[PDB]
Amino acid sequence: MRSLTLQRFPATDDVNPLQAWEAADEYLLQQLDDTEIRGPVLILNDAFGALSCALAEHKPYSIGDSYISELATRENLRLNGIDESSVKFLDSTADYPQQPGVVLIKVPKTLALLEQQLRALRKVVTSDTRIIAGAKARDIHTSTLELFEKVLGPTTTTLAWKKARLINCTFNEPQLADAPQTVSWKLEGTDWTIHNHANVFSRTGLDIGARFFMQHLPENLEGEIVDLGCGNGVIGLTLLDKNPQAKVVFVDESPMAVASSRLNVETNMPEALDRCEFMINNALSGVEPFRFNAVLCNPPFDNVAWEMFHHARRCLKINGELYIVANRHLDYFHKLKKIFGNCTTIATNNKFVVLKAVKL
Numbered sequence: 001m002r003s004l005t006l007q008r009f010p011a012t013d014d015v016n017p018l019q020a021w022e023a024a025d026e027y028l029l030q031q032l033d034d035t036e037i038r039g040p041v042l043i044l045n046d047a048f049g050a051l052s053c054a055l056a057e058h059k060p061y062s063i064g065d066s067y068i069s070e071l072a073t074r075e076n077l078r079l080n081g082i083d084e085s086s087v088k089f090l091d092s093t094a095d096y097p098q099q100p101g102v103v104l105i106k107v108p109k110t111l112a113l114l115e116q117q118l119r120a121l122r123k124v125v126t127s128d129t130r131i132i133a134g135a136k137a138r139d140i141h142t143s144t145l146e147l148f149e150k151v152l153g154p155t156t157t158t159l160a161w162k163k164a165r166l167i168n169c170t171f172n173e174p175q176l177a178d179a180p181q182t183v184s185w186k187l188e189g190t191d192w193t194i195h196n197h198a199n200v201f202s203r204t205g206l207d208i209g210a211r212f213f214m215q216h217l218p219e220n221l222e223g224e225i226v227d228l229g230c231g232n233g234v235i236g237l238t239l240l241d242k243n244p245q246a247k248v249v250f251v252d253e254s255p256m257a258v259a260s261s262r263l264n265v266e267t268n269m270p271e272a273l274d275r276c277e278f279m280i281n282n283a284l285s286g287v288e289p290f291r292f293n294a295v296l297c298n299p300p301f302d303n304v305a306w307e308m309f310h311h312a313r314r315c316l317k318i319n320g321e322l323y324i325v326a327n328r329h330l331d332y333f334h335k336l337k338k339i340f341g342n343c344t345t346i347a348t349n350n351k352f353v354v355l356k357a358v359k360l
């Protein structure tokens with residue numbers, strides 16, 4: 001956009017509708033064209049760093065719940081000959097810089113994340129703060145606006161431009177009851193309470209894919225085993241409780257997922273903390289090959305799952321095992337067989353299948 005060269009993480013080609021930026025980003029930017037910018041500049045959910053690159057000279061803070069976004073942003077900064085140091089990266093749960101002058105928000109996929117972010121902004125914005133949100137027009141719902149009025153203040157909206165649309169907010173500090181950071185629920189059949197940060201997968205209750213997976217999890221495992229894409233950590237917890245001698249690596253792209261996992265171990269079995277590693281990563285990038293005895297994965301429901309499978313194969317030991325839950329209809333059996341040479345169906349739901357591939 002605007003003479004910047006920008007690439008998605010995993011880079012895509014020219015006919016892939018998925019690109020590094022969308023109209024919404026440019027529309028947002030254009031709101032500031034006739035503006036003298038006063039930092040701090042906060043940028044939320046900047047997916048591949050388009051806004052961060054555009055506004056680097058102002059030394060923006062890029063806030064979000066995605067390490068992939070940070071990686072992508074650093075790459076794009078480099079492709080544009082901009083210093084990495086120009087952009088400061090913050091997790092969504094962190095304390096935001098006080099008295100920001102400009103807050104740009106890409107509306108996130110989930111209402112819950114948006115609300116936690118607006119409550120976090122509520123602590124730092126003033127009525128002088130220029131607050132603007134942008135997204136595909138179709139992603140701007142009445143509920144979105146309502147959220148804004150509830151937490152920050154009165155909203156104005158713009159016309160559509162290339163399927164994108166924006167919201168302007170003027171901070172009112174409206175009357176608001178405080179709300180918890182996490183949503184908790186009891187894991188059936190357990191003494192465990194599972195806490196879930198705003199952006200965590202299936203945060204309101206146990207995922208049925210995971211419920212099916214937990215029944216056919218491998219036991220009597222040693223060495224290190226991976227909860228690859230851990231989310232709230234439930235699989236990891238179950239592995240710790242099932243494999244007394246193993247250490248468990250909780251891995252997720254989302255710092256909120258990792259935080260949730262850490263919290264759930266600290267909360268439901270602190271005596272096991274000595275055997276846990278909590279890693280924020282893009283799958284297993286930069287991880288030593290031949291390190292693990294087992295990897296367990298409930299891939300997002302794709303290029304992604306295949307990336308995970310490959311990482312799994314690479315970092316597994318010989319005879320190490322990858323276990324997966326997947327929707328029954330995807331051809332994951334054959335992708336696994338291709339990647340590993342083998343594959344075995346452990347179990348199958350009405351909707352889910354648990355697969356197993358050995359590293360050869």
Ligand SMILES: C[S@@+](CC[C@H](N)C(=O)[O-])C[C@H]1O[C@@H](n2cnc3c(N)ncnc32)[C@H](O)[C@@H]1O
Nearest residue numbers: 201210229230231252253254282283298299300
């Ligand atoms: C379907 S959820 C599985 C959650 C939990 N392990 C379970 O079984 O219920 C998939 C998780 O993978 C994470 N994820 C997506 N892409 C990733 C990536 N490239 N690297 C690491 N984790 C990723 C997502 O944040 C999400 O938490």
